[PDB]
Design a protein around this ligand. Structure first.
Ligand SMILES: [Mg+2]
Ligand SMILES: [Mg+2]
Ligand SMILES: [Mg+2]
Ligand SMILES: [Mg+2]
Ligand SMILES: [Mg+2]
Ligand SMILES: [Mg+2]
Ligand SMILES: [Mg+2]
Ligand SMILES: [Mg+2]
Ligand SMILES: [Mg+2]
Ligand SMILES: [Mg+2]
Ligand SMILES: [Mg+2]
Ligand SMILES: [Mg+2]
Ligand SMILES: [Mg+2]
Ligand SMILES: [Mg+2]
Ligand SMILES: [Mg+2]
Ligand SMILES: [Mg+2]
Ligand SMILES: [Mg+2]
Ligand SMILES: [Mg+2]
Ligand SMILES: [Mg+2]
Ligand SMILES: [Mg+2]
Ligand SMILES: [Mg+2]
Ligand SMILES: [Mg+2]
Ligand SMILES: [Mg+2]
Ligand SMILES: [Mg+2]
Ligand SMILES: [Mg+2]
Ligand SMILES: [Mg+2]
Ligand SMILES: [Mg+2]
Ligand SMILES: [Mg+2]
Ligand SMILES: [Mg+2]
Ligand SMILES: [Mg+2]
Ligand SMILES: [Mg+2]
Ligand SMILES: [Mg+2]
Ligand SMILES: [Mg+2]
Ligand SMILES: [Mg+2]
Ligand SMILES: [Mg+2]
Ligand SMILES: [Mg+2]
Ligand SMILES: [Mg+2]
Ligand SMILES: [Mg+2]
Ligand SMILES: [Mg+2]
Ligand SMILES: [Mg+2]
Ligand SMILES: [Mg+2]
Ligand SMILES: [Mg+2]
Ligand SMILES: [Mg+2]
Ligand SMILES: [Mg+2]
Ligand SMILES: [Mg+2]
Ligand SMILES: [Mg+2]
Ligand SMILES: [Mg+2]
Ligand SMILES: [Mg+2]
Ligand SMILES: [Mg+2]
Ligand SMILES: [Mg+2]
Ligand SMILES: [Mg+2]
Ligand SMILES: [Mg+2]
Ligand SMILES: [Mg+2]
Ligand SMILES: [Mg+2]
Ligand SMILES: [Mg+2]
Ligand SMILES: [Mg+2]
Ligand SMILES: [Mg+2]
Ligand SMILES: [Mg+2]
Ligand SMILES: [Mg+2]
Ligand SMILES: [Mg+2]
Ligand SMILES: [Mg+2]
Ligand SMILES: [Mg+2]
Ligand SMILES: [Mg+2]
Ligand SMILES: [Mg+2]
Ligand SMILES: [Mg+2]
Ligand SMILES: [Mg+2]
Lengths: 122, 117, 204, 59, 137
RNA sequence: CCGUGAGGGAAAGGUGAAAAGAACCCCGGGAGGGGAGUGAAAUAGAGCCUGAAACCGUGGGCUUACAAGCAGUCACGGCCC
RNA sequence: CGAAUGCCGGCAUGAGUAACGAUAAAGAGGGUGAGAAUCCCUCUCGCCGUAAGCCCAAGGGUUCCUACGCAAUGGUCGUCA
RNA sequence: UCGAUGUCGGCUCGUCGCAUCCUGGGGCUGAAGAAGGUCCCAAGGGUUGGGCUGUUCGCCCAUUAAAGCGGCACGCGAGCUGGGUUCAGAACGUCGUGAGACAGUUCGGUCUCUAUCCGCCACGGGCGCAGGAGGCUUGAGGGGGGCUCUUCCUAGUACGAGAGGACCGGAAGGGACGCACCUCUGGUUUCCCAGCUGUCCCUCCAGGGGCAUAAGCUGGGUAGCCAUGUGCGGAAGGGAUAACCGCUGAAAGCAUCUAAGCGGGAAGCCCGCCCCAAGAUGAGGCCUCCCACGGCGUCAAGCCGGUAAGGACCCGGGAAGACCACCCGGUGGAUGGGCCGGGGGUGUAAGCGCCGCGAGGCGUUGAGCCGACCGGUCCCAAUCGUCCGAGGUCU
């Protein structure tokens, strides 16, 4: 469950390191963002000369959440941190690589290249 | 709203327990005890258990009983005299009969908690 | 308008295809049709169904043997289905087939005297900062001199629950005829052992 | 001495009308089967003693 | 009506019985998964079983692993989408029932606080009974 | 009684002609009563002459749970005396 | 005298309502007695113990002890003080 | 109104207006399409989260279908707050010889447990319903609810030089909201289980008890109650209409939606859906029960005591509940307690044996203990009883 104010960990090589949710782009007033949902965040931490800088207002898709995610088959998945991948306005990843596992919900929500680039899809 | 669950009160935990513990002692000691209805009813089950561990008589039961009745001698009587008195009875070693008339002081309704026979 | 009586037994989940299905088990036992309402004598059409067998002899006067279906005269009184009229013998679960959509009625659990917050999910006051004696209070309930009163039923603290509730359009996930069981897809008012009435929905 | 106070003295009628419910209800008794005495149902009274039921004194 | 429970264990005839016994030691593995069209391709999940909440037909258990720097836990029903549930070290030997404590100080420390269940393992390799004498009497 | 103090500053009168102030008996632990007895009178029985009003009761007569009011007034009608 | 937030007194209303004064905590068996959860005893239980124990000075003025007692004073009760 | 009508802003809780921000209908367009503009009809439902300032307000950030404008003592302090302002302190600038002052700033500054009446939310008691009862019901009349977005298919098709890009119809997902629920997910679970410290104690070791909160601490945790979890809902459909568009058609040989008659037409109106409801004294209906004058007035209660069908009382209880009520039991009995079995939680009890000098470790052992849950069993307790309650007025 991600809400404005939450700090996510960037699971990619766009240079960013940490982003803080600024809004969940789902509706007029959605309360939380989960895996697959898109957000607009502020870049809090970034590595020297990278594709993105701090202060930058970016978009990213949530690939990992500390709050467990329930699958219709009755099981659930959950990760140790909240991570996202910086996405461009056409919803493609601004980065080229991606790290750590990503929930599979991303596959059934369109984000194909993030998933292919992911070292594991659970 | 609650009571969807069981057991009574009107004292904090440590007190409520200590209470049942004392009535128990007094009941195994005298056979018949007179207290207020609520207290009496809530007592029946607590002591029925104690006596049932007596029926066992395997020490573990003894040390289990001693946890609530600290008086070693009391337990001895409990294991040597009261216990046998049933041994064939399948539960319900306690009886409770309410008396007419109340405390002309607070109007609390009283009852009898008897060791049955 | 298909309608049967039953008792909520409890809920669990099964597996259909490859998804878990929260389901509420119901017991729509053999309901003895005990009476019929007719536009001539009753003015409207309906079947008083009977439910829950046994009952030694605590029936007295309402020894309604007017219909041989006096079958021991069931416990959980009788209840009409309205606009139903089957083979005047007995209504069993067969009435429904897996895949149908039912509307189940029951009496919701009773939370007794509820606070404005739990009842009307009110916002309430703050837990700090300002005062500290109205954290669970309704706040204002009026204006001033005008109207100088309080609207009828302006939502307030009081009894809540233990009332008729109907949740609609539930998929009958299954029906075990040999045991009088019936499986709906989750959510059903009232407590286990509570009485309910399962009917045909209104979706078309 | 504080905040809400009654606006007017409640009239004798209005006062008495409220107590329309304060009327007490008789204790419920029954004849004891062992002796000639009245006592509350489901209770062991002194008079008799309950076919043994831990009774008072008697010779 | 006269046995909610019973008349409920009766619906629960969706109960598996082909799965290995195990506690809060080390299981993992499994399982099915229906993605991109087909309900095919079985994905495995190796890990320490952090918890088992029992409740008849629907008792569930969670397994914990550390996939590529990130820790992950999965909750399985116990019946349905589970082809096989073989298990690694019986390990177990956990004085606790729910060992979420391994989440905050895991690494080498985990394997130190979770010693092999020198016992249940013995009856694992022992009570195995691998006698292929079949057809000789 | 109040105030450290200077000082402030109350309330409270009446049995009967005569105590003749109710022996004794009965219920009650007592209080209090019921009888008895005193007296012209005891609803003169004792903080007792007379003992008003507010106020609290018991009994009775008329009257009230589809009506709404500065509570009364005018008019018929019913019930009771 | 009907009024002066009048003055003295009496009795109402709110009302069988809020309260009954630290959340350290009670239970039972005997006894006494006209009657006591409330007095006495016994046994359990809880609290204080740089004390909620002991002693002195001030202030208080018989509150000390004991025998009869329970109208009232004791925030209930009372045989107890 | 000065023998007192508490004053800004916020919070809470709504409710109304329409001069409409979105959504729905529609006319004109300098409307190709798509996207706009403008006016008419239309509040049913909606109308986001933040940064700054006490702010209202505004200015920004990020979204949105939209981020409407007003009223209700600039709604709402016997509902909360007290940040702004208006008491006493202190200081700056400034004015004044001064004491002091200033719609100038600055720091600080006591907003009163008790609701009588109306009103409102809930729950009863009384009587009435023109025989008395136990059930099941009709629904006058109320209330609830009415939201909206994206994508895909029609179809890259009408339209369009191009770029772009529809109507109508049809699908699948969302967001907020509403009701109910606990299977799952996730909470809590005050003593269910275990672990731990200090101290006092039981009984010296071992094993235990109190206290260290009104749980000593720690790790867990069933039932129940729960949202973060789960399932459903908004409808569909019928009817009358708004603006608007017509058919036929005179007055006015043409024309005209109008004058007569007939149509089409909104998220709106009525009904449909869910809930309450006959105190609907207009007191309704259906089913089944019990029925008689026995003694007594002005001869059908205007009458007394037993009665009848039934009903209270009392008891054992309840996912019912403040009380009351409601619901289920009362020995012809499984209602509560216990006992037994199973769930479920703890996570290998004590004791004993073996290994180690010892802390400890193996084993017996998933042992021991064990609330509520699913059920069995009359072992304990619902002993025994009592009191009400017809005898039914008119063409
Ligand atoms: Mg304690
Ligand atoms: Mg027990
Ligand atoms: Mg309840
Ligand atoms: Mg809050
Ligand atoms: Mg305050
Ligand atoms: Mg008004
Ligand atoms: Mg009166
Ligand atoms: Mg003085
Ligand atoms: Mg004389
Ligand atoms: Mg005189
Ligand atoms: Mg004189
Ligand atoms: Mg006089
Ligand atoms: Mg007088
Ligand atoms: Mg009178
Ligand atoms: Mg009327
Ligand atoms: Mg009348
Ligand atoms: Mg008049
Ligand atoms: Mg005067
Ligand atoms: Mg005058
Ligand atoms: Mg005067
Ligand atoms: Mg006065
Ligand atoms: Mg009074
Ligand atoms: Mg009272
Ligand atoms: Mg009051
Ligand atoms: Mg009160
Ligand atoms: Mg009180
Ligand atoms: Mg006190
Ligand atoms: Mg106190
Ligand atoms: Mg303590
Ligand atoms: Mg201590
Ligand atoms: Mg100290
Ligand atoms: Mg001295
Ligand atoms: Mg003295
Ligand atoms: Mg003394
Ligand atoms: Mg003395
Ligand atoms: Mg006293
Ligand atoms: Mg005034
Ligand atoms: Mg308009
Ligand atoms: Mg266009
Ligand atoms: Mg408004
Ligand atoms: Mg106000
Ligand atoms: Mg201020
Ligand atoms: Mg302040
Ligand atoms: Mg300060
Ligand atoms: Mg209606
Ligand atoms: Mg009405
Ligand atoms: Mg749960
Ligand atoms: Mg739960
Ligand atoms: Mg859980
Ligand atoms: Mg323990
Ligand atoms: Mg200790
Ligand atoms: Mg101690
Ligand atoms: Mg639980
Ligand atoms: Mg024409
Ligand atoms: Mg028309
Ligand atoms: Mg039409
Ligand atoms: Mg109804
Ligand atoms: Mg009426
Ligand atoms: Mg009626
Ligand atoms: Mg009727
Ligand atoms: Mg039982
Ligand atoms: Mg039982
Ligand atoms: Mg059991
Ligand atoms: Mg188990
Ligand atoms: Mg077990
Ligand atoms: Mg068990």
């Amino acid at each position: 469950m991600i809400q404005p104010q939450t700090y996510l960990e960037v699971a990619d090589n766009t240079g960013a390191r940490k982003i803080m949710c600024i809004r969940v782009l789902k509706g007029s007033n959605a309360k939380y963002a989960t895996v697959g949902d898109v957000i607009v965040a502020s870049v809090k931490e970034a590595i020297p000369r990278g594709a993105v800088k701090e202060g930058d207002v970016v978009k990213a898709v949530v690939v990992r959440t500390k709050k467990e995610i329930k699958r219709p088959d009755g099981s659930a998945i959950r990760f140790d941190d909240n991570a996202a991948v910086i996405i461009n306005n056409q919803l493609e990843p601004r980065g080229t690589r991606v790290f750590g596992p990503v929930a599979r919900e991303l596959r059934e929500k369109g984000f194909m290249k993030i998933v292919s680039l992911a070292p594991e899809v659970l | 709203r609650h009571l969807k669950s069981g057991r009574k009160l009107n004292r904090h935990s440590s007190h409520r327990l200590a209470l049942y513990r004392n009535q128990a002692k007094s009941l195994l000691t005298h056979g018949r005890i007179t207290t207020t209805v609520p207290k009496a009813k809530e007592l029946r089950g607590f002591v029925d258990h104690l006596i049932h561990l007596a029926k066992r008589g395997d020490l573990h039961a003894r040390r289990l009983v001693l946890r609530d009745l600290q008086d070693v001698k009391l337990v001895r009587k409990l294991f040597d005299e009261i216990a046998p008195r049933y041994r064939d009875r399948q539960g319900g070693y306690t009886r409770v009969l309410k008396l007419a008339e109340r405390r002309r002081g607070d109007g609390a309704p009283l009852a009898l908690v008897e060791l049955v026979e | 308008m298909k309608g049967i009586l039953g008792v909520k037994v409890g809920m669990t989940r099964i597996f259909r295809d490859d998804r878990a299905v929260p389901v509420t088990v119901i017991l729509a036992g053999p309901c003895p049709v005990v009476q019929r309402r007719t536009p001539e004598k009753d003015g409207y059409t309906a079947v008083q169904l009977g439910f829950l067998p046994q009952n030694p002899k605590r029936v007295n006067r309402p020894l309604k043997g007017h219909f041989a279906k006096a079958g021991v005269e069931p416990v959980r009184i009788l209840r009409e289905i309205r606009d139903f009229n089957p083979e005047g013998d007995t209504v069993t679960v067969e009435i429904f087939k897996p895949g149908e959509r039912v509307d189940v009625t029951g009496t919701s659990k009773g939370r007794g005297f509820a606070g404005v917050m739990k009842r009307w999910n009110f916002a309430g006051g703050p837990d700090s900062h300002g005062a500290h004696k109205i954290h669970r209070h309704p706040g204002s309930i009026g204006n001033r001199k005008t109207p100088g009163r309080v609207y009828k039923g302006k939502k307030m603290a009081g009894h809540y629950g233990a009332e008729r509730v109907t949740v609609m359009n539930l998929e009958v996930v299954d029906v075990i005829p040999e045991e009088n069981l019936l499986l709906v897809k989750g959510a059903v008012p009232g407590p286990n052992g509570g009485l309910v009435i399962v009917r045909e929905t209104k979706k078309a | 001495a504080k905040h809400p106070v009654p606006k007017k003295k409640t009239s004798k009628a209005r006062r008495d009308a409220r107590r329309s419910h304060h009327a007490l209800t008789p204790p419920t008794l029954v004849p004891c089967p062992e002796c000639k005495a009245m006592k509350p149902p489901h209770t062991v009274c002194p008079e008799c003693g309950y076919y043994a039921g831990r009774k008072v004194l008697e010779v | 009506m006269n046995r909610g429970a019973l008349i409920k264990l009766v619906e629960s005839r969706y109960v598996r019985t082909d799965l290995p016994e195990f506690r809060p030691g080390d299981t993992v593995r499994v399982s099915y998964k229906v993605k991109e069209g087909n309900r095919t391709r079985i994905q495995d999940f190796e890990g320490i079983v952090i918890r088992i909440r029992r409740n008849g037909f629907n008792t569930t258990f969670t397994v914990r692993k550390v996939s590529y720097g990130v820790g992950v836990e999965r909750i399985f029903p116990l019946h349905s989408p589970l082809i096989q549930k073989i298990d690694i070290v019986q390990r177990g030997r956990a004085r606790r029932a729910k060992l979420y404590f391994i989440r905050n100080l895991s690494d080498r420390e985990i394997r130190r606080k979770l010693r092999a269940d020198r016992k249940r393992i013995d009856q694992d390799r022992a009570a195995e009974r691998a006698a292929k004498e079949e057809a000789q009497k």
